[PDB]
């Protein structure tokens, strides 16, 4: 018998970023996640991890025969500082040990201090170098530190402006991380400067039950109807999520 959170756990499943961004991580561990991305009801989108393990995953993935899964990595992060040659350094290596996308945190802090610019300089010379390799580049805000809708909106734009092809909401790495406010207000971004079809969304960061990514796909059907989010246009940043929609399914 077909449900709403079947219905919708599925989904999520299938537009994940299965992530560990740990201090302890390893090649075991990794190994071990790009295991967990290949589930008894299909693939995770994608997986996300530091730039080192790139080559152990892409060898795995390629190993147990999902070689489509996509490689996903954070520069910047979580720091979000404002120097533009480090942020660009860390995205050139991260193309270089092979990701197909690199999630870079927003300099948010500078953003808070009044200056917009060196945002859209930061993000902008991150998109070029990933354009040239055919690398998606996905912008994390930290909405839990920026707070007001103002600064979230603004530095939505800002991004979108500079070329992102994803706004992500955090880095789960601050307190406040996704919440359903805050991916509303950045979705109501993506519709209000008229880019459904070049910028997709992520919430992040403590999205942890079947329920909890319910919500935020109920947000993304009511504001661009239900075929919109696709890989390309949507994904779950999640360390500890997929156990709990295998479970919905039936099959955890
Ligand atoms: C970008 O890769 C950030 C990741 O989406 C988050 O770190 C995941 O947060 P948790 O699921 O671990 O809370």
Redesign the pocket.
Known sequence: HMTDLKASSLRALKLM?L?T?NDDDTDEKVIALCHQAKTPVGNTAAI?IYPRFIPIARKTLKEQGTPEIRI?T?TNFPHGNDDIDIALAETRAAIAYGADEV?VVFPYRALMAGNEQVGFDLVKACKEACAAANVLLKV?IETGELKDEALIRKASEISIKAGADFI?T????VAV?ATPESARIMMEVIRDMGVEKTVGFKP????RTAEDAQKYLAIADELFGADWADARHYRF?????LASLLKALGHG
Do not use: H, M, R
């Not at 992040?204 to 999205?207: F, H, R, T």
């Open positions: 970023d992530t961004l996300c996903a954070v999630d994390i992500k955090s880095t789960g790495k991380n992040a960061g403590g999205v940043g999640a360390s500890s999520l």
